[model samples]
Target: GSSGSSGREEDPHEGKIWFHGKISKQEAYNLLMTVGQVCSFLVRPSDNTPGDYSLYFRTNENIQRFKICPTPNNQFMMGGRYYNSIGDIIDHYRKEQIVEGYYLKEPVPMQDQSGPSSG
Candidate 1:
């Protein structure tokens, strides 16, 4: 999602200014497992609960673009940062509110790039 010419996800350490945060051992393990089980293109259910933070991921150019998803009704475009475990997209504002970075710390999960949902 970052601004480079490449289409693949980039490494967190390879680009940009840095801000680091801690994820619990449990969280890191769980997310790693989830990444293995879930496909980037498929929608799933939210696994995040109280005190559990969702991993927000993006490529460099992607973060700058601030791309948004269209509403379900096709009424307007919605903007935001971060998404949930289910692949549901959340606004950048919401992501900013809860996250520690102005940029990505790692190449974690990002909103689905396949476009807005039809259902």
Candidate 2:
């Protein structure tokens, strides 16, 4: 469920197209379906019980969403893999495979006026 900001802080992840905060799984799925591009992906805070975070990515013919669990040391995990930050995770997957054939990819930008703003 998408909502407007009431009070703000550095809580929600933004700036990167790959990082979406508090977005429901259905919303995430719709975004990918709208793009209809291979390898397009987005990460969102989970909407399910034990909601933490999950990676929703699209392959040629399938859409896969995997939960990302964190460890005691702040390292993020996806089953066998670990990452220092979300950015690193996204970057690595673009070059490497997440599984056998699936990899992280950005949804093609349909509207672009500004540039990627890092915070």
Candidate 3:
């Protein structure tokens, strides 16, 4: 679902990571499972735009935000880091000891409720 360009605008936050695209709940769950630990994380829809999802991770006394982008290879670019999958991304933080213990206790499904309108 992720497909959009920032038009190369200057970001206010110097080191903030901007993921470009929409990610499904299922994809997010997979990312969570890769961490295999319990910590703090959040997945929610973006307020500014529809079909956009936001993923937040807490570690190293700071919370980082990443926009969800759907990729077949699970490739994602975060700030100064480019990763192939969510696991790899999380591992980077873990390696730096910025964060650890990320796990999802329940299942999150991507739901769609819509129908063709008759005029």
Candidate 4:
């Protein structure tokens, strides 16, 4: 129905207000209802290089619209294999029962050498 499809066309942030400071729980819930859920992504390097960076998303629909604006939260459940392919970025969530404990994101710095690594 058009009513259901309206969500697809309306601004996803419509009826939501940007949080600038501390707010009440009621305001927080209202904001949550309006914003819905957040979609997160973990972009990893396919070959550990800037040029070989690969993108992994939460859903295939978002994948189709990968280049599109306003991507969804990675928290959205869409029933898909997150780490079946090689070089695939995995969601590695707690509920999936695949991993335990918090995963910390740290950047490893590497010096670019034009002598051997590049060639």
User: Among these predicted structures, which one has the highest lDDT?
Assistant: 2
- Where does model 3 exceed 4 Å of error? 1-39, 43-53, 58-64, 68-74, 98-119
Tens digits of per-residue lDDT, candidate 2, 12-112, equal 35555567654556766776778546777777776664647787777777888788886777888886787897778878877888779776656433323
TM-score of each: 0.17, 0.70, 0.32, 0.17
TM-score of 4: 0.17
Q: Quick one: best TM-score, which candidate?
A: 2
Alpha-carbon RMSD, each predicted model: 16.7, 8.4, 12.9, 19.8
The sequence of per-residue lDDT tens digits that candidate 3 reaches over residues 77-107 is 4554557765465546644543345442322
lDDT of 1 at 77: 38
lDDT of 1 at 44: 20
lDDT of 1 by residue, 39-96 (tens): 1111121234332223333322222222234334433232443344222333333444
Cα deviation of 16 in candidate 2 (Å)?
A: 2.5
Q: What lDDT does each candidate get?
A: 0.33, 0.69, 0.48, 0.29
Clashes of 1: 11
Candidate 3 at residue 20, lDDT?
21
